[PDB]
Amino acid sequence: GTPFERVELALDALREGRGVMVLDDEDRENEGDMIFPAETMTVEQMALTIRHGSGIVCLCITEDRRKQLDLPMMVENNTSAYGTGFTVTIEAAEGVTTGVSAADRVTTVRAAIKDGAKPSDLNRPGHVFPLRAQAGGVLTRGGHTEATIDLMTLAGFKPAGVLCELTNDDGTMARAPECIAFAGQHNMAVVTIEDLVAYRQAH
Amino acid sequence: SSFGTPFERVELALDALREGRGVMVLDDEDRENEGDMIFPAETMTVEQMALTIRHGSGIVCLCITEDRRKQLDLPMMVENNTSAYGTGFTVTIEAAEGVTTGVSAADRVTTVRAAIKDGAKPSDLNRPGHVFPLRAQAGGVLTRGGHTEATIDLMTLAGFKPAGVLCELTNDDGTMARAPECIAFAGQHNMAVVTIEDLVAYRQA
Numbered sequence A: 001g002t003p004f005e006r007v008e009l010a011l012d013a014l015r016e017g018r019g020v021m022v023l024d025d026e027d028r029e030n031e032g033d034m035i036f037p038a039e040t041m042t043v044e045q046m047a048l049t050i051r052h053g054s055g056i057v058c059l060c061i062t063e064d065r066r067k068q069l070d071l072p073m074m075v076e077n078n079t080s081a082y083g084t085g086f087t088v089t090i091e092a093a094e095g096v097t098t099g100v101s102a103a104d105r106v107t108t109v110r111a112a113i114k115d116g117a118k119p120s121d122l123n124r125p126g127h128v129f130p131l132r133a134q135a136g137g138v139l140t141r142g143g144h145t146e147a148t149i150d151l152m153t154l155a156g157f158k159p160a161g162v163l164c165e166l167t168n169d170d171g172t173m174a175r176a177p178e179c180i181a182f183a184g185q186h187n188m189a190v191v192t193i194e195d196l197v198a199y200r201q202a203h
Numbered sequence B: 001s002s003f004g005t006p007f008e009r010v011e012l013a014l015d016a017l018r019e020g021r022g023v024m025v026l027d028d029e030d031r032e033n034e035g036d037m038i039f040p041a042e043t044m045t046v047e048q049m050a051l052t053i054r055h056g057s058g059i060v061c062l063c064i065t066e067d068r069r070k071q072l073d074l075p076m077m078v079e080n081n082t083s084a085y086g087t088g089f090t091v092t093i094e095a096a097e098g099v100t101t102g103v104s105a106a107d108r109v110t111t112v113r114a115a116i117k118d119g120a121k122p123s124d125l126n127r128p129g130h131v132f133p134l135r136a137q138a139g140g141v142l143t144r145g146g147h148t149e150a151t152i153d154l155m156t157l158a159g160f161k162p163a164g165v166l167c168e169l170t171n172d173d174g175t176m177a178r179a180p181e182c183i184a185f186a187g188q189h190n191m192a193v194v195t196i197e198d199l200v201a202y203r204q205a
């Protein structure tokens, strides 16, 4: 397909309760992140993500939601190679045990994204990793974090999505051909950040 | 499914660590009821890291002492720790050299090695990152019966640097492995099984 078509197909997939495989630039991370809307991701989708992802399952959120939840950025002097926007980590205050099962990570995501969520609904630290997206989305920063928020908002959801990088069992990160094969195995749409940037520049 | 005394289980685990094998550490059934795969930070292989990500939560942690935390200038992640188990997460880390994105098994190992190197400085680690240090409480399992303290105590008793990598064993269906699954897993992977209770008994003696 074309770039705009891949974006459109990705929005349909998110609306249908399917995941999307998001590939960033080859000259950047060259990684594929599986993403789901925070509002609809299931425990089975979370199990899938832990099984075949890095297991570092992230919750992409806006600056306003970060402030609503009172989640400081993890560090002041961000020296990460890619400037990744990790906040302090989180666990649901209620409805979990140790916080790390697929079910507990989903409970934590739902507590964080609920309308009216308050800081006391989350304990810290925890086993879910929120990432704060920059305003302007992929028009500001071409990361998976912004890409996730932009796809959610374009699909009609709250600007809140769950992401994890796809990993091969031998410990190497999946490259684009592996990400596309995996997307086929799990009926996910595939889209690139480059597609998304072009789409938003036009639209 | 158990054999022998607590003391032998501990000694078997020390041998396993020296031999380059993992240890499966079970905490109290009334605490987390979880088994963590553990390896010395010094000798853990890329293959072992890949095994840990594949079978574990993927939240692979590096147990360190307070002295090492200070040496690396790693703040505790939160001032007011409200976690269910009071887990000692510091700010997260990535090697400043010799990695790409930080997340591959190879890159996580590189990061662990950078953090534990003799003479490691704060500038050897970028923050935040894909490896999660856990700071052990003074007194080890005699103060806090956690996987973090168990790891440090085991490495210490085995003769290693007080630094160990851990991750909780996860079933493929996303539920956490309980003792029977952890014991079966450890058997299949030639990891020595030991309980925090065993280790408390050993250290008190």
Ligand SMILES: [Mg+2]
Binding pocket: A098, B032, B085, B087
């Ligand atoms: Mg735990």
Ligand SMILES: [Zn+2]
Binding pocket: A004, A203
């Ligand atoms: Zn159009």
Ligand SMILES: [Zn+2]
Binding pocket: A048, A051
């Ligand atoms: Zn699967």
Ligand SMILES: [Zn+2]
Binding pocket: A051, A052
């Ligand atoms: Zn599978």
Ligand SMILES: [Zn+2]
Binding pocket: A063, A064
């Ligand atoms: Zn705002």
Ligand SMILES: [Zn+2]
Binding pocket: A098, A100, A127, B168
């Ligand atoms: Zn844990």
Ligand SMILES: [Zn+2]
Binding pocket: A024, A029, A031, A033, A143, A144, A145
């Ligand atoms: Zn990314």
Ligand SMILES: [Zn+2]
Binding pocket: A048, A185, A186, A187
């Ligand atoms: Zn599937």
Ligand SMILES: [Zn+2]
Binding pocket: B051, B055, B189
């Ligand atoms: Zn295995």
Ligand SMILES: [Zn+2]
Binding pocket: A165, B101, B103, B130
């Ligand atoms: Zn990552």
Ligand SMILES: [Zn+2]
Binding pocket: B121, B123, B124
């Ligand atoms: Zn240096």
Ligand SMILES: [Zn+2]
Binding pocket: B027, B032, B034, B036, B146, B147, B148
């Ligand atoms: Zn534990």
